[PDB]
Amino acid sequence: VDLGTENLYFQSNAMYEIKGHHHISMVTKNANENNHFYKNVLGLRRVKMTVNQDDPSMYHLFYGDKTGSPGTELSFFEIPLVGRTYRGTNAITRIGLLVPSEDSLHYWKERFEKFDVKHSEMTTYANRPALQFEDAEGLRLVLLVSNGEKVEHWETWEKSEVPAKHQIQGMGSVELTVRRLDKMASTLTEIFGYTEVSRNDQEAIFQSIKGEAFGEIVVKYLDGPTEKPGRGSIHHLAIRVKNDAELAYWEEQVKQRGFHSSGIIDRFYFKSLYFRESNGILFEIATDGPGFTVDGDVEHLGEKLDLPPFLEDQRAEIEANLAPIEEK
Ligand SMILES: [Zn+2]
Numbered sequence: 530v531d532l533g534t535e536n537l538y539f540q541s542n543a544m545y546e547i548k549g550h551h552h553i554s555m556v557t558k559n560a561n562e563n564n565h566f567y568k569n570v571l572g573l574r575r576v577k578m579t580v581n582q583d584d585p586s587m588y589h590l591f592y593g594d595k596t597g598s599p600g601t602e603l604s605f606f607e608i609p610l611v612g613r614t615y616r617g618t619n620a621i622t623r624i625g626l627l628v629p630s631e632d633s634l635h636y637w638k639e640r641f642e643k644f645d646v647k648h649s650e651m652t653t654y655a656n657r658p659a660l661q662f663e664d665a666e667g668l669r670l671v672l673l674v675s676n677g678e679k680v681e682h683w684e685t686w687e688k689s690e691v692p693a694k695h696q697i698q699g700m701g702s703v704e705l706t707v708r709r710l711d712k713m714a715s716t717l718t719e720i721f722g723y724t725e726v727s728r729n730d731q732e733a734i735f736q737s738i739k740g741e742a743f744g745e746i747v748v749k750y751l752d753g754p755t756e757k758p759g760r761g762s763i764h765h766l767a768i769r770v771k772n773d774a775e776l777a778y779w780e781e782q783v784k785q786r787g788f789h790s791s792g793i794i795d796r797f798y799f800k801s802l803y804f805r806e807s808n809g810i811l812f813e814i815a816t817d818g819p820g821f822t823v824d825g826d827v828e829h830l831g832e833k834l835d836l837p838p839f840l841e842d843q844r845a846e847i848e849a850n851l852a853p854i855e856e857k
Contacts, residue, residue: 543722545775549680549743550700551767551799551815552591552602553624555668558760560588560607561855566664567592567603569857570644572691575831576821578854581606582796582837585847588854594699595684597821597830599769600743601699612759614667619809620756621763622749623704624668625654626697627675627742633695634660637672640691655702655734655747666761673701673742680743701742702734703766705810710750712807717746720782721768737768744768755809767801767813776800779814797837798823 557563567590568575576597581587587608593601603624616622628634634651637660641648649661658674675698685693707713714733717723723735723746730750737744756762770776776793783790783804791803801815821830834851836844 540724541719541722543720544778545770547721547723547737547744548769548771548817549600549737549741550703551599551769551813551817552593552604553621553700553703553766554604554606554764556611556758556760556762556764557590557605557607557666558609558611560590560605561857562665563590563605563607564854565857567605569690570640570646572686572689572696573601573603574686574689576602577604577798577835578831578833579835579837580840580847580851582840585840585843586850588851590854591821591831595686596827598680598682598684598699599815599817599820600680601683606764608760614759614762615754615757616667617754617756618706618708618751620706620758621703621766621810622669622706622756623702623747624670624763625673625700625702625704625742625745625747626670627679627699627701628672628697629675629677629694631658631674634658634672634674636692636695637662655745657701657742664761668761668763669704671702672697675701675742678742699743702745702747704747704749705766705808706749706751706756707808707810708750708752708755709808710748713748713810716786716806717748720786765803765811765813767815769817770814772816772818773800776802776814776816783814 567573573592576593577591579589581589591602591604647663652659654671660672663669679698683699685696717735723737724739726734733748735746780790788804793802799816801813803813805811
Protein backbone atom coordinates (compact mmCIF):
# COMPACT_ATOMS: atom_id res chain seq x y z
CA VAL A 530 0.00 0.00 0.00
CA ASP A 531 1.12 3.56 -0.80
CA LEU A 532 1.21 5.03 2.71
CA GLY A 533 3.59 7.98 2.31
CA THR A 534 3.97 11.06 0.11
CA GLU A 535 3.97 9.25 -3.25
CA ASN A 536 0.92 11.05 -4.65
CA LEU A 537 1.50 14.56 -3.23
CA TYR A 538 1.83 17.63 -5.47
CA PHE A 539 4.99 19.79 -5.31
CA GLN A 540 5.67 22.70 -7.76
CA SER A 541 9.29 21.80 -8.41
CA ASN A 542 11.65 19.01 -7.62
CA ALA A 543 13.59 21.44 -5.40
CA MET A 544 14.65 19.70 -2.18
CA TYR A 545 15.27 22.91 -0.21
CA GLU A 546 13.84 26.42 0.01
CA ILE A 547 15.91 29.46 -0.93
CA LYS A 548 15.36 32.12 1.73
CA GLY A 549 16.35 35.14 -0.33
CA HIS A 550 19.20 37.08 -1.86
CA HIS A 551 22.59 36.82 -0.11
CA HIS A 552 24.48 39.76 -1.61
CA ILE A 553 25.04 41.58 -4.85
CA SER A 554 28.42 42.69 -6.21
CA MET A 555 29.33 45.64 -8.47
CA VAL A 556 32.26 47.48 -10.02
CA THR A 557 33.25 51.03 -8.95
CA LYS A 558 35.96 53.25 -10.42
CA ASN A 559 36.57 55.22 -7.20
CA ALA A 560 36.43 53.86 -3.64
CA ASN A 561 36.42 57.32 -2.00
CA GLU A 562 33.27 58.38 -3.89
CA ASN A 563 31.73 54.92 -3.51
CA ASN A 564 32.28 54.97 0.24
CA HIS A 565 30.79 58.43 0.52
CA PHE A 566 27.65 57.39 -1.34
CA TYR A 567 26.87 54.03 0.28
CA LYS A 568 27.89 54.94 3.82
CA ASN A 569 27.31 58.68 4.16
CA VAL A 570 24.38 59.24 1.78
CA LEU A 571 22.61 55.88 1.97
CA GLY A 572 23.51 55.38 5.63
CA LEU A 573 24.66 51.74 5.30
CA ARG A 574 27.46 50.37 7.47
CA ARG A 575 30.78 49.63 5.80
CA VAL A 576 30.95 46.11 7.16
CA LYS A 577 34.19 45.04 5.47
CA MET A 578 37.11 46.75 3.83
CA THR A 579 39.20 44.06 2.13
CA VAL A 580 40.70 43.01 -1.24
CA ASN A 581 39.49 40.82 -4.10
CA GLN A 582 40.57 37.36 -2.97
CA ASP A 583 41.29 36.49 -6.63
CA ASP A 584 43.33 39.74 -7.05
CA PRO A 585 44.79 41.31 -3.84
CA SER A 586 45.62 44.58 -5.70
CA MET A 587 41.95 45.55 -5.90
CA TYR A 588 39.78 46.90 -3.03
CA HIS A 589 36.62 44.98 -2.25
CA LEU A 590 34.23 47.00 -0.05
CA PHE A 591 31.02 45.61 1.55
CA TYR A 592 28.13 47.68 2.89
CA GLY A 593 25.08 46.40 4.74
CA ASP A 594 23.31 46.33 8.05
CA LYS A 595 24.86 46.25 11.55
CA THR A 596 26.66 42.94 10.87
CA GLY A 597 26.53 42.77 7.09
CA SER A 598 23.98 39.97 7.40
CA PRO A 599 22.90 37.90 4.34
CA GLY A 600 20.36 39.86 2.37
CA THR A 601 21.80 43.28 3.22
CA GLU A 602 25.20 43.16 1.54
CA LEU A 603 26.15 45.36 -1.44
CA SER A 604 29.77 44.93 -2.37
CA PHE A 605 32.00 46.79 -4.83
CA PHE A 606 35.35 45.99 -6.48
CA GLU A 607 37.30 49.18 -7.08
CA ILE A 608 38.91 49.13 -10.52
CA PRO A 609 40.47 52.61 -10.97
CA LEU A 610 41.00 52.41 -14.78
CA VAL A 611 37.63 50.92 -15.63
CA GLY A 612 35.51 52.59 -18.34
CA ARG A 613 31.83 53.48 -18.44
CA THR A 614 29.04 50.92 -18.65
CA TYR A 615 27.24 50.80 -21.96
CA ARG A 616 23.68 49.77 -21.03
CA GLY A 617 21.97 46.88 -22.76
CA THR A 618 20.55 43.41 -22.29
CA ASN A 619 21.81 40.17 -20.71
CA ALA A 620 22.74 41.94 -17.51
CA ILE A 621 21.61 42.37 -13.90
CA THR A 622 20.20 45.88 -14.14
CA ARG A 623 18.56 47.18 -10.89
CA ILE A 624 18.96 46.74 -7.14
CA GLY A 625 15.80 46.98 -5.04
CA LEU A 626 16.31 48.08 -1.40
CA LEU A 627 13.50 47.77 1.19
CA VAL A 628 12.52 50.73 3.41
CA PRO A 629 9.87 50.48 6.10
CA SER A 630 7.13 52.91 4.99
CA GLU A 631 5.78 55.30 2.35
CA ASP A 632 6.90 57.94 4.88
CA SER A 633 10.51 56.65 4.51
CA LEU A 634 10.12 57.29 0.78
CA HIS A 635 9.40 60.94 1.59
CA TYR A 636 12.41 61.05 3.90
CA TRP A 637 14.54 59.63 1.08
CA LYS A 638 13.22 61.99 -1.58
CA GLU A 639 14.28 64.98 0.56
CA ARG A 640 17.66 63.40 1.32
CA PHE A 641 18.31 62.74 -2.37
CA GLU A 642 17.44 66.39 -3.13
CA LYS A 643 19.87 67.51 -0.43
CA PHE A 644 22.69 65.34 -1.73
CA ASP A 645 22.03 65.90 -5.44
CA VAL A 646 21.31 62.24 -6.06
CA LYS A 647 19.57 61.41 -9.32
CA HIS A 648 16.07 60.18 -8.43
CA SER A 649 12.56 59.67 -9.74
CA GLU A 650 9.28 60.91 -8.40
CA MET A 651 7.16 58.62 -6.25
CA THR A 652 6.26 55.55 -8.30
CA THR A 653 5.48 51.84 -8.30
CA TYR A 654 8.00 49.04 -8.88
CA ALA A 655 7.03 45.37 -8.94
CA ASN A 656 3.73 46.20 -7.24
CA ARG A 657 5.25 48.17 -4.36
CA PRO A 658 5.41 51.91 -3.69
CA ALA A 659 8.87 52.96 -4.83
CA LEU A 660 11.45 55.66 -5.52
CA GLN A 661 14.01 55.06 -8.23
CA PHE A 662 17.50 56.49 -7.98
CA GLU A 663 21.06 56.15 -9.39
CA ASP A 664 24.55 56.57 -8.11
CA ALA A 665 27.07 58.78 -9.93
CA GLU A 666 28.38 55.77 -11.92
CA GLY A 667 25.02 54.93 -13.46
CA LEU A 668 24.09 52.09 -11.12
CA ARG A 669 20.31 51.87 -10.94
CA LEU A 670 18.60 51.34 -7.59
CA VAL A 671 15.05 51.51 -6.30
CA LEU A 672 13.68 52.03 -2.82
CA LEU A 673 10.70 49.78 -2.12
CA VAL A 674 8.17 49.91 0.69
CA SER A 675 8.31 46.91 2.95
CA ASN A 676 5.64 47.80 5.53
CA GLY A 677 8.35 46.85 8.05
CA GLU A 678 8.73 43.27 6.79
CA LYS A 679 12.28 42.05 7.21
CA VAL A 680 14.53 39.00 7.31
CA GLU A 681 14.64 38.13 11.02
CA HIS A 682 18.42 38.53 11.32
CA TRP A 683 18.58 42.06 9.84
CA GLU A 684 19.56 44.88 12.25
CA THR A 685 19.57 48.63 11.82
CA TRP A 686 22.84 50.46 12.33
CA GLU A 687 23.04 52.78 15.36
CA LYS A 688 25.85 54.96 13.95
CA SER A 689 24.09 55.63 10.63
CA GLU A 690 23.37 59.17 9.45
CA VAL A 691 19.81 57.92 8.82
CA PRO A 692 17.10 57.53 11.48
CA ALA A 693 16.50 53.86 12.35
CA LYS A 694 12.88 53.98 11.18
CA HIS A 695 13.84 55.06 7.63
CA GLN A 696 17.02 53.03 7.16
CA ILE A 697 17.45 50.74 4.23
CA GLN A 698 16.56 47.27 5.57
CA GLY A 699 18.22 45.07 2.96
CA MET A 700 17.59 43.79 -0.56
CA GLY A 701 14.22 43.42 -2.20
CA SER A 702 13.51 42.93 -5.93
CA VAL A 703 16.59 42.43 -8.14
CA GLU A 704 16.06 43.10 -11.87
CA LEU A 705 17.53 40.84 -14.60
CA THR A 706 17.30 42.02 -18.25
CA VAL A 707 17.60 39.15 -20.72
CA ARG A 708 17.15 38.12 -24.40
CA ARG A 709 15.39 34.88 -23.44
CA LEU A 710 12.90 35.39 -20.63
CA ASP A 711 11.58 31.82 -21.04
CA LYS A 712 15.00 30.33 -20.38
CA MET A 713 15.52 32.48 -17.28
CA ALA A 714 12.05 31.61 -15.99
CA SER A 715 12.75 27.89 -16.44
CA THR A 716 15.98 28.19 -14.45
CA LEU A 717 14.30 29.95 -11.55
CA THR A 718 11.18 27.79 -11.36
CA GLU A 719 12.35 24.37 -12.54
CA ILE A 720 15.71 24.24 -10.84
CA PHE A 721 15.40 26.58 -7.91
CA GLY A 722 11.68 26.26 -7.15
CA TYR A 723 10.95 30.00 -7.28
CA THR A 724 7.30 30.95 -7.37
CA GLU A 725 6.14 32.73 -10.51
CA VAL A 726 4.10 35.75 -9.39
CA SER A 727 3.32 36.93 -12.91
CA ARG A 728 4.59 36.48 -16.47
CA ASN A 729 4.10 37.93 -19.91
CA ASP A 730 6.40 38.32 -22.93
CA GLN A 731 7.86 41.59 -21.61
CA GLU A 732 8.32 40.89 -17.87
CA ALA A 733 7.94 38.19 -15.28
CA ILE A 734 8.27 38.35 -11.47
CA PHE A 735 9.48 35.50 -9.27
CA GLN A 736 9.81 35.04 -5.55
CA SER A 737 12.14 32.59 -3.82
CA ILE A 738 9.59 32.35 -1.01
CA LYS A 739 5.98 33.00 -2.08
CA GLY A 740 4.82 36.37 -0.76
CA GLU A 741 8.26 37.62 0.28
CA ALA A 742 10.29 40.48 -1.19
CA PHE A 743 13.62 39.22 0.13
CA GLY A 744 14.35 36.91 -2.80
CA GLU A 745 12.26 38.58 -5.49
CA ILE A 746 13.58 38.68 -9.06
CA VAL A 747 12.08 40.83 -11.83
CA VAL A 748 12.95 39.43 -15.27
CA LYS A 749 12.68 41.85 -18.21
CA TYR A 750 12.91 40.98 -21.89
CA LEU A 751 15.08 43.35 -23.89
CA ASP A 752 16.45 42.78 -27.38
CA GLY A 753 19.29 44.82 -28.80
CA PRO A 754 22.94 44.95 -27.77
CA THR A 755 24.21 43.18 -24.71
CA GLU A 756 25.41 45.44 -21.93
CA LYS A 757 29.12 46.22 -21.99
CA PRO A 758 29.93 46.42 -18.31
CA GLY A 759 32.20 48.98 -16.68
CA ARG A 760 31.85 51.27 -13.66
CA GLY A 761 28.37 51.02 -12.19
CA SER A 762 27.88 47.50 -13.53
CA ILE A 763 26.51 44.61 -11.50
CA HIS A 764 28.86 41.64 -11.67
CA HIS A 765 26.74 38.90 -9.98
CA LEU A 766 23.81 38.17 -7.71
CA ALA A 767 24.24 35.71 -4.82
CA ILE A 768 21.37 33.72 -3.31
CA ARG A 769 21.24 32.17 0.16
CA VAL A 770 21.56 28.57 1.23
CA LYS A 771 21.56 27.32 4.83
CA ASN A 772 24.76 25.29 4.95
CA ASP A 773 27.39 23.33 3.05
CA ALA A 774 25.04 20.36 2.56
CA GLU A 775 22.52 22.52 0.73
CA LEU A 776 25.35 24.13 -1.28
CA ALA A 777 26.50 20.67 -2.44
CA TYR A 778 22.93 19.76 -3.35
CA TRP A 779 22.64 22.86 -5.54
CA GLU A 780 25.99 22.21 -7.17
CA GLU A 781 24.62 18.86 -8.26
CA GLN A 782 21.38 20.39 -9.59
CA VAL A 783 23.26 23.02 -11.59
CA LYS A 784 25.54 20.40 -13.15
CA GLN A 785 22.57 18.20 -14.13
CA ARG A 786 21.10 21.09 -16.10
CA GLY A 787 24.37 21.44 -18.07
CA PHE A 788 25.57 24.61 -16.49
CA HIS A 789 29.25 24.77 -15.63
CA SER A 790 29.90 25.31 -11.93
CA SER A 791 33.03 27.07 -10.59
CA GLY A 792 33.14 24.39 -7.91
CA ILE A 793 32.66 25.22 -4.23
CA ILE A 794 35.13 27.92 -3.14
CA ASP A 795 35.73 28.96 0.47
CA ARG A 796 35.36 32.73 0.59
CA PHE A 797 36.05 32.68 4.36
CA TYR A 798 32.91 34.61 5.31
CA PHE A 799 30.90 31.92 3.45
CA LYS A 800 31.35 29.10 0.95
CA SER A 801 29.93 29.53 -2.54
CA LEU A 802 29.81 28.44 -6.13
CA TYR A 803 29.24 30.45 -9.29
CA PHE A 804 27.50 29.57 -12.55
CA ARG A 805 26.24 31.47 -15.58
CA GLU A 806 22.81 30.74 -16.99
CA SER A 807 21.63 30.67 -20.61
CA ASN A 808 21.58 34.48 -20.98
CA GLY A 809 25.04 34.88 -19.46
CA ILE A 810 23.79 36.17 -16.09
CA LEU A 811 26.29 35.20 -13.31
CA PHE A 812 24.72 33.76 -10.24
CA GLU A 813 26.43 32.75 -7.02
CA ILE A 814 25.04 30.35 -4.43
CA ALA A 815 26.39 31.25 -0.97
CA THR A 816 26.03 29.86 2.52
CA ASP A 817 24.53 32.13 5.22
CA GLY A 818 27.44 31.49 7.52
CA PRO A 819 29.76 31.99 9.10
CA GLY A 820 29.53 35.68 8.21
CA PHE A 821 31.66 38.77 8.82
CA THR A 822 31.80 38.33 12.62
CA VAL A 823 33.80 35.11 12.19
CA ASP A 824 37.11 37.10 12.16
CA GLY A 825 36.19 40.18 14.21
CA ASP A 826 33.91 41.83 16.74
CA VAL A 827 30.72 43.60 15.62
CA GLU A 828 31.96 46.77 17.35
CA HIS A 829 34.83 47.33 14.92
CA LEU A 830 33.62 45.79 11.61
CA GLY A 831 34.88 47.60 8.54
CA GLU A 832 37.28 49.97 10.28
CA LYS A 833 40.59 48.51 9.12
CA LEU A 834 41.88 46.46 6.21
CA ASP A 835 40.79 42.89 6.80
CA LEU A 836 42.37 39.96 5.01
CA PRO A 837 41.53 36.28 4.73
CA PRO A 838 44.18 34.26 6.66
CA PHE A 839 45.97 33.08 3.49
CA LEU A 840 46.88 36.67 2.58
CA GLU A 841 48.32 37.92 5.90
CA ASP A 842 51.70 36.68 4.61
CA GLN A 843 51.41 39.42 1.98
CA ARG A 844 49.88 42.17 4.16
CA ALA A 845 52.99 44.39 3.87
CA GLU A 846 52.93 44.11 0.07
CA ILE A 847 49.12 44.43 -0.17
CA GLU A 848 49.00 47.47 2.14
CA ALA A 849 51.87 49.19 0.32
CA ASN A 850 49.97 49.01 -3.01
CA LEU A 851 46.69 50.48 -1.66
CA ALA A 852 45.71 54.13 -1.18
CA PRO A 853 43.80 54.81 2.03
CA ILE A 854 40.07 55.44 1.65
CA GLU A 855 39.53 59.12 2.37
CA GLU A 856 36.44 60.20 4.32
CA LYS A 857 34.85 63.24 2.67
ZN1 LIG B 1 29.82 37.24 -4.44
